[PDB]
Structure 1
Amino acid sequence: AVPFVEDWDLVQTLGEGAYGEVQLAVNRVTEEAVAVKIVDMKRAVDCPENIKKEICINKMLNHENVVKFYGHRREGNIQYLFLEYCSGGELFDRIEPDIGMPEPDAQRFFHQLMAGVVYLHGIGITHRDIKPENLLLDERDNLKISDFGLATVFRYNNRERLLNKMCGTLPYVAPELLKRREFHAEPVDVWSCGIVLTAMLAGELPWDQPSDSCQEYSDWKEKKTYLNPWKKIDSAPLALLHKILVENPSARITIPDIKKDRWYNKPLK
């Protein structure tokens, strides 16, 4: 057995939020870099469960558009997760405030986000918190869906399970999660992918939350795409946004038909 191979040094402190601390671990022998999430199962009614589900799902995921899972280590209260390293940073960190990015790049990113979500969904799992700070990028600039701390399975043994736990991020959360007691997991994830498309194409967020009480959300229902936040979006990708940001979750577009979308399949643009 090659000596010293199980010794990753925590070079940098990648993240530092509500979760715990994410360090950039580099192997002592190989130098393989990796991201290490240090989750803290404290007290007696918090992470002891918060992390088991995140770790249980990660042990299923296997798509090149999803952050690869290596392993984990339960040391007393400190739980270390071995996940993929994305030197690309956050997609979020590639959106020019109030501007966006070149329309071609959005399209690419949107394809890979669709890729992973199709995959995730395939294996009955919903992320529930799709947003630019969760869409990581690597060396070749490929999109990776990360952080499955709120992901849950919505299909098991071929039975869909409606949801009712309100979790995610206000601006990105779909409308039905704030107006309906129960809802289908998948359409909530497409809606968020849609909120990302607009962010990627306008460098700004449509509204604070998908509720009548919110100025812009209402004008979007008025179809006031004039000189308002969507005035920065081209009619092609705007036509698609009209289909995703549909309120009735049952009338929304579905990942399959998004692939059949014009802009989605228009070259370079």
Structure 2
Amino acid sequence: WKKQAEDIKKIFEFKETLGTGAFSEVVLAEEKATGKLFAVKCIPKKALKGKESSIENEIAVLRKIKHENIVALEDIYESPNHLYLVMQLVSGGELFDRIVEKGFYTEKDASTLIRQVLDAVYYLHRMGIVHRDLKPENLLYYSQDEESKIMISDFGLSPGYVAPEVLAQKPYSKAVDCWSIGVIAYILLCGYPPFYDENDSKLFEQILKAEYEFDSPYWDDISDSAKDFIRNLMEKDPNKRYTCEQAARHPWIAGDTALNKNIHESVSAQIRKNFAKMRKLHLGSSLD
């Protein structure tokens, strides 16, 4: 390792808050010496009182990992009261915004997104890292290009997306990441979270018992292969739950069972209900 700074503000100009959690905040910051922009995760040291050593081991591994679909941890700074994770800035745009504005959106688009997420988390699991906070807001596009890759853009060093065994207060595993990927896939195909209720206590019971359905009519035009894929990831028993490597082989990801039907109308309509907000000329540039 951690670089030392008496005043982190001598190194970075903090410009814009990007997200605030219970124990950290990510801020868009400019390296004063270079003008380069980064996403700096600011962590108060008091929040890490229970197990500083495990966080130190995790960040040390994160510094060495490198993956297409994972933000790079470029540096670690330390002040008397804070830890600063200097992350690569992903400015391509948010996942749900992109889908709403698309106009044409299919299972193949959703499968392409999940395929990248599966590969990134599989790699993380191979390196001994459990992400623990996989959710749509942590997925950002690398660039504005329509074919841009998606990127896991934040880390969960510390209820709708969390696995039942976590709610049961059972010990975490890599399997909790796989459950979360299944929840992301569910939302990508219908636009609403699999578990909801006005009463928080009844919502807890529904997640704990894994009570969800592929509700009509929203799922009527979704392929059976996609539902089978989600079922194996959103499996209550972690002993029976798909691994990332298993899910990557499923025909919905690795094969051709993902449909090309335009589901944008229903999916974007549900997203708005649940989440608050190259041109080529024929025989000219088309011949590339």
Same fold (TM over 0.5): yes
Shift of 1:172: 1.2
Partner of 1:190: 178
Sort the Cα spacing of 1:177 and 1:42 in 2 relative to 1 into closer, same or farther, 3 A. Answer: closer
Report the equivalent of 2:141. Answer: 137
Deviation at 1:173, TM superposition (A): 1.4
Look up the match of 2:6: none
Deviation at 1:235, TM superposition (A): 2.4
Tell me which residue corresponds to 2:276: none
Percentage of identical aligned residues = 32
- Residue segments in structure 2 that go unaligned for 5+ positions in a row: 1-9, 197-201, 261-288
Inter-partner Cα distance in structure 2 for 1:214 and 1:81: 32
2:253 is the alignment partner of 1:264: yes
Partners of 1:213 and 1:110 lie apart in 2 by 25
Is the contact made by 1:72 and 1:82 (CA closer than 8 Å) also made in structure 2? Answer: yes
For 1:204, the equivalent position in structure 2 comes to: 192
Q: Select the structure with the greater relative contact order (CA < 8 A; seq sep ≥ 6).
A: 2
In the TM superposition, residue 46 of structure 1 has moved relative to its aligned partner by: 6.9
Q: Paired residue for 1:167?
A: none
Structure 1: 4+ residue segments shifted above 6 A:
46-50
Q: 1:210 to 1:39 in 2, by over 3 A?
A: same
Cross-structure match for 2:226: 237
Given residue 14 of structure 2, which amino acid in structure 1 is its aligned partner? Answer: L
Tell me how many residue pairs correspond in the alignment: 240
Deviations 1:77-134 (A, max 9, x none): 133221110002433544549x995433212211110111010000111111111112
Q: Closer, same or farther in 2 for the Cα pair 1:25/1:181, shift >3 Å?
A: closer
Q: Deviations over 1:164-197 (max 9, x none)?
A: xxxxxx21112233347346x1221111100000
1:65 aligned residue: 69
Residue matched to 1:84? 88
Q: Is the 8 A contact 1:51 1:149 kept in 2?
A: no
Deviation at 1:57, TM superposition (A): 3.9
Relative to structure 2, which stretch is displaced further, 43-52 or 132-141? 43-52
Q: For the residues of structure 2 that align with 1:56 and 1:150, how far apart are their CA atoms? A: 12
Distance 1:212 1:18 in 2: 24
What value does the CA root-mean-square deviation take over the aligned residues? 3.5
Q: Calculate the TM-score normalised by the size of structure 1.
A: 0.73
Which segment is superposed worse, 52-61 or 32-41?
52-61
Say if 2:164 and 2:208, in contact at 8 Å, map to a contact too: no
TM-score by length of 2: 0.69
**CA deviation map 1:36-59 (0-9, x unaligned):** 122222489479679645533422
* 1:136–1:144 contact (8 Å) kept in structure 2: yes
8 A contact 2:28–2:40 mirrored in 1: yes
What's the CA shift string for 1:18-52, capped at 9, x where partnerless? 34432222345654321112222248947967964
Distance 2:162 2:48 in 1: 29
Give the unaligned 5+ runs of structure 1.
1-5, 152-169
User: Alpha-carbon deviations, 1:195-238, whole Å to 9, x = none?
Assistant: 00011111110104886546994353xxxx35165446332312
2:108 is matched with which residue? 104
